[PDB]
Design a protein around this ligand. Sequence first.
Ligand SMILES: *[C@@H]1O[C@H](CO)[C@@H](O[C@@H]2O[C@H](CO)[C@@H](O[C@@H]3O[C@H](CO[C@H]4O[C@H](CO)[C@@H](O)[C@H](O)[C@@H]4O)[C@@H](O)[C@H](O[C@H]4O[C@H](CO)[C@@H](O)[C@H](O)[C@@H]4O[C@H]4O[C@H](CO)[C@@H](O)[C@H](O)[C@@H]4O[C@H]4O[C@H](CO)[C@@H](O)[C@H](O[C@H]5O[C@H](CO)[C@@H](O)[C@H](O)[C@H]5O)[C@@H]4O)[C@@H]3O)[C@H](O)[C@H]2NC(C)=O)[C@H](O)[C@H]1NC(C)=O
Ligand SMILES: *[C@@H]1O[C@H](CO)[C@@H](O[C@@H]2O[C@H](CO)[C@@H](O[C@@H]3O[C@H](CO[C@H]4O[C@H](CO)[C@@H](O)[C@H](O[C@H]5O[C@H](CO)[C@@H](O)[C@H](O)[C@@H]5O[C@H]5O[C@H](CO)[C@@H](O)[C@H](O)[C@@H]5O)[C@@H]4O)[C@@H](O)[C@H](O[C@H]4O[C@H](CO)[C@@H](O)[C@H](O)[C@@H]4O)[C@@H]3O)[C@H](O)[C@H]2NC(C)=O)[C@H](O)[C@H]1NC(C)=O
Ligand SMILES: *[C@@H]1O[C@H](CO)[C@@H](O[C@@H]2O[C@H](CO)[C@@H](O)[C@H](O)[C@H]2NC(C)=O)[C@H](O)[C@H]1NC(C)=O
Ligand SMILES: OC[C@H]1O[C@@H](SCCc2ccccc2)[C@H](O)[C@@H](O)[C@H]1O
Ligand SMILES: *[C@@H]1O[C@H](CO)[C@@H](O)[C@H](O)[C@H]1NC(C)=O
Ligand SMILES: *[C@@H]1O[C@H](CO)[C@@H](O)[C@H](O)[C@H]1NC(C)=O
Length: 986
Amino acid sequence: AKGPLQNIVTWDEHSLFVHGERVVIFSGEVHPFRLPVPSLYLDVFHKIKALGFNTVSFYVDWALLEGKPGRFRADGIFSLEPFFEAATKAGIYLLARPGPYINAEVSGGGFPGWLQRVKGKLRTDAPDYLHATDNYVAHIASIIAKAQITNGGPVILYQPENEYSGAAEGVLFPNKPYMQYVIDQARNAGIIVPLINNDAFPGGTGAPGTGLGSVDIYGHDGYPLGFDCAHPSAWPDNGLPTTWRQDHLNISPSTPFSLVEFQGGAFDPFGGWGFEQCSALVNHEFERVFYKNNMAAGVTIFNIYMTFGGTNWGNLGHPGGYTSYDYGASIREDRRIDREKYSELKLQGQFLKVSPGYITATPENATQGVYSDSQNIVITPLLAKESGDFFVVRHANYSSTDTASYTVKLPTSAGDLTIPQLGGSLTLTGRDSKIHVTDYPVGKFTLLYSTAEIFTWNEFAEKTVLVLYGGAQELHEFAVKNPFGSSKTAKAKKIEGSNVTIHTTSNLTVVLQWTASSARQVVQLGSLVIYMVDRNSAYNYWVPTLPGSGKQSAYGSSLMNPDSVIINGGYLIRSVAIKGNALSVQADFNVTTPLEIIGIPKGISKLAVNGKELGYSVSELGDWIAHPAIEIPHVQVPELTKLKWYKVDSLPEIRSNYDDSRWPLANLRTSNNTYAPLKTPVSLYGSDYGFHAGTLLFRGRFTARTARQQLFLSTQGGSAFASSVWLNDRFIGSFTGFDAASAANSSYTLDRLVRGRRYILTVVVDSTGLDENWTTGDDSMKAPRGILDYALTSSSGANVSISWKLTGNLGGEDYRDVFRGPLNEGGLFFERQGFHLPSPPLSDFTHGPSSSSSSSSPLDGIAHAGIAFYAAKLPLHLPAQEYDIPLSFVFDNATAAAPYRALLYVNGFQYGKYVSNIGPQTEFPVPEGILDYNGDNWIGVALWALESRGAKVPGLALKSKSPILTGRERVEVVKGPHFKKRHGAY
Ligand SMILES: *[C@@H]1O[C@H](CO)[C@@H](O[C@@H]2O[C@H](CO)[C@@H](O[C@@H]3O[C@H](CO[C@H]4O[C@H](CO)[C@@H](O)[C@H](O)[C@@H]4O)[C@@H](O)[C@H](O[C@H]4O[C@H](CO)[C@@H](O)[C@H](O)[C@@H]4O[C@H]4O[C@H](CO)[C@@H](O)[C@H](O)[C@@H]4O[C@H]4O[C@H](CO)[C@@H](O)[C@H](O[C@H]5O[C@H](CO)[C@@H](O)[C@H](O)[C@H]5O)[C@@H]4O)[C@@H]3O)[C@H](O)[C@H]2NC(C)=O)[C@H](O)[C@H]1NC(C)=O
Ligand SMILES: *[C@@H]1O[C@H](CO)[C@@H](O[C@@H]2O[C@H](CO)[C@@H](O[C@@H]3O[C@H](CO[C@H]4O[C@H](CO)[C@@H](O)[C@H](O[C@H]5O[C@H](CO)[C@@H](O)[C@H](O)[C@@H]5O[C@H]5O[C@H](CO)[C@@H](O)[C@H](O)[C@@H]5O)[C@@H]4O)[C@@H](O)[C@H](O[C@H]4O[C@H](CO)[C@@H](O)[C@H](O)[C@@H]4O)[C@@H]3O)[C@H](O)[C@H]2NC(C)=O)[C@H](O)[C@H]1NC(C)=O
Ligand SMILES: *[C@@H]1O[C@H](CO)[C@@H](O[C@@H]2O[C@H](CO)[C@@H](O)[C@H](O)[C@H]2NC(C)=O)[C@H](O)[C@H]1NC(C)=O
Ligand SMILES: OC[C@H]1O[C@@H](SCCc2ccccc2)[C@H](O)[C@@H](O)[C@H]1O
Ligand SMILES: *[C@@H]1O[C@H](CO)[C@@H](O)[C@H](O)[C@H]1NC(C)=O
Ligand SMILES: *[C@@H]1O[C@H](CO)[C@@H](O)[C@H](O)[C@H]1NC(C)=O
């Protein structure tokens, strides 16, 4: 790396520049493959734009796009085109992270399962691995190249590879020829924007200056609390990073300090704590302490992983996680932005985007007892000659939940001042951190200092507006350099509030003190109007940007200090636009509230909200107060237990009339899997035969030699898998699984056999996905699925041979549903047949009354070990044009219930794997777009009873969240193909 290849996106020690403007990049991670509803991407982009972010970072999952080697397919729900179009329409730039390896808690870390057939070490310059990535990178980097800002699109940065940060013992690292080949694939496909990496820690790998394989901007990650959400209140000693400014200067001082992934939640395994408990660990307190600590080090490219997590639908996740990928993120899986951490993150995004002085201030060492007489707080200064200083304050024990009283002594253009200058003390409550400022520009005005935090400011036609906030009951002070100008008359005016005090010095510096509370204080100083609110009130303010013109209209007048309107009230403000003499607002409301609009453009006299005109009151400061009609209706949804359920047996394999003549033979005598050399005479690894997704089945023929024989069977499905065995129709046993078991050794007696007769063992092995490969040189993604080893011995100790057949999804890599992708289906009979698809062939199913002996309902289940599939039509008629109504399917986990596994299908998409004896997921959201809110839907539930007494689903319900009156763009239903009989199925 030797400089920029283009002049649109450039950089220096302090920041990125976009179109010549210095900017703080504040980005949220979103994975387009985890939300297969193209019309919903604009919804998530409006929610992230409203935080004050300007960028989204995204992965691309190779395993979904090249499920058949040599056939790259990114059409329909797999196209990035609607994702790019929504970023341009929202005014968001993108950091593209296509891998090939992405990790991401996805199956294989993004590697397709056919890489288990590649001998060479993954993520090295073994040429079989390198060349296996070429077709994918050539296609995905050319699609990203067309979307670069240099071509009028949203992409501004590209990440090659992922967290290339160490290697197994004895493996070359860093492997600079490998790194360089991955760069060359991107540059050869037309990527000309800067390249950025994401080292796990500040190891220096790939930094500028390291020669072959170096990127343009050195990036690293941070997950300081880890990923285990067992104790969400516990912040352990030494958890806060305190060395990153000096580590940056030691590794890559020529480029901006960049945290390309920083903790926005945590992943959660089977048997984990649930994502509500992750959201309690990475909560609003974590954001204010840890994210302001990154500002203390001068971060200027900062991406929060995850900002919206989505769902691991269609088996796309790895075994170390389950169906949800809510991640505890600021935006929930079902897209709601009610968590307090969302509103706290918005206060920080809105501050940085009006604060260009922060970019060129220089961060210095943290101090204790230097900028305050108190030693109970630590203060990190960011200092500049004239353009303004910033001071990050935290408790000395960063974990402290105590409240401290303090004052500060800060450098200013008027000299060093102990603040408050008018008396009193500041307060830092538990797990809080503040940024205080000196010589902070507010348009034409200047804050000589402020203890209160800045939410936003802007210069409008008739006034300049500044919004300041504090936690409740905190005293704050700020000072404004002479705001009157030449005026002899001019004096402050108190507009609202009865606690604020005003003091003027002889040189006309105005000093204001106030104590934050629910009651806003407002003071006018000439044409400057200051609004002083508490934190909880500031959570409800929004700063939508005014559009510019042309294709890039949504990016506004500039990235920093954009033309804006300030709006107090609402669950979300998505956008504003000027339409003649009207201001038109798009907004969502989850509760009733008024709206106050601050900074009305000149000549505008009409207001609309969500396309409906409304009147307004005018305040003495020229703000509008409007009262939109907000009706939050009671929503009734259908009771699932009352739908007409149909049932089909999904284990016909164990009946004596089953014909397996169409099954693939498991007759490969060698494997290319170098990670797990064969122990058996033939490969029984699914991926060796093209089966990489979901449940596998094996059928083993043998001729009985003695009446009793002993079977040893070693199966592997990934963490929290299970396996079940039958001898002809006789149930032998199950390995019922647990969170810590990815394989199992099982021994069974096969008794009462007729010597000379042929028997068939049917073995079902679930797979919870392919493992990741996060240590280069340890080929962990190659861990196979299926049968690792076996032995069948007679009662005299002779070895008895078994000949095998197997299946996964019908077709393997020639998978049958091109619309829903290569991973959606496993190998269970009902999946193979396509019986999970909309409008299934009801002649092949049975129906009978619930609670009866012939019930076809999953609530009645089955009375033996086995596998059944249940399907029902679910009509919905909900007011989706006006409301966003999140729906989910909830299983009851009754303490007395036999163990089972279940699969949830909605309109042909697999949207849940439920494991009754492992957990933790019971509630499975499914988005509108996959569900049709004004038409028929098909839902499906597979039931796998693991023990001999059978199983049933104890309760299953459709649940709704409180409806949100919405101004989103309309959600279009995803039109997947319906059932058609499959030729060659079995
Ligand atoms: C319906 O209700 C029922 C009844 O309530 C629920 O059933 C209950 O389910 C729970 C959870 O599954 C289950 O408890 C677990 O039991 C298993 C099995 O143990 C038993 O069997 C084994 C095998 O014979 C014996 O050897 C044992 O003695 C025991 O008899 C056990 O492994 C679990 O242990 C974990 O949790 C304990 C804390 O609760 C710990 O003390 C353990 O050390 C262990 O801890 C792991 O998991 C914790 C939770 O995630 C985690 O905090 C901790 O750090 C550690 O994580 C590591 O290991 C786990 C694997 O165990 C792994 O998942 C993690 O991996 C992730 O993280 C890595 C590092 O970042 C990452 O690399 C990786 O990719 C990630 O995936 C990590 O390596 C636990 O005791 C109960 O037995 C069961 N009760 C009954 C009566 O059946 C049921 O769940 C409910 N169903 C629904 C749908 O909700
Ligand atoms: C409609 O959409 C809106 C959003 O637009 C949703 O509103 C959000 O609802 C969520 C869920 O209820 C709210 O989050 C939860 O908030 C509660 C209440 O606490 C908050 O509000 C009170 C004021 O009512 C504040 O006093 C709280 O702040 C104090 O305490 C927190 C510690 O909780 C501390 O960090 C603060 O600094 C502050 O401390 C000061 O006061 C305390 C008390 O006097 C004092 O001891 C201390 O010294 C300081 O002086 C706080 O802002 C909160 O209890 C919950 O937290 C718990 O759960 C989460 C896990 O879920 C954990 O992360 C956390 O650790 C706690 O265990 C939640 O944070 C959210 O605030 C609210 N947002 C807005 C904008 O209103 C609606 O729900 C939606 N409604 C519908 C129908 O859809
Ligand atoms: C830093 O402050 C934290 C937060 O108060 C302290 O953590 C507490 O430690 C006590 C005593 O061991 C526990 O009983 C509390 O439950 C902890 N509280 C929380 C919320 O985790 C911590 O010990 C202090 N660290 C140092 C070095 O002083
Ligand atoms: O959700 C976890 C994420 O971890 C990071 S590596 C982070 C390595 C690290 C771990 C702990 C502290 C610091 C860095 C990956 O790049 C993501 O794809 C995703 O898997
Ligand atoms: C092993 O890899 C080679 C590609 O080098 C291929 O020709 C062969 O069929 C593979 N064999 C198996 C058993 O996957
Ligand atoms: C199964 O047993 C074999 C042979 O003893 C051993 O190599 C292997 O580690 C065992 N696997 C498990 C999951 O216990």
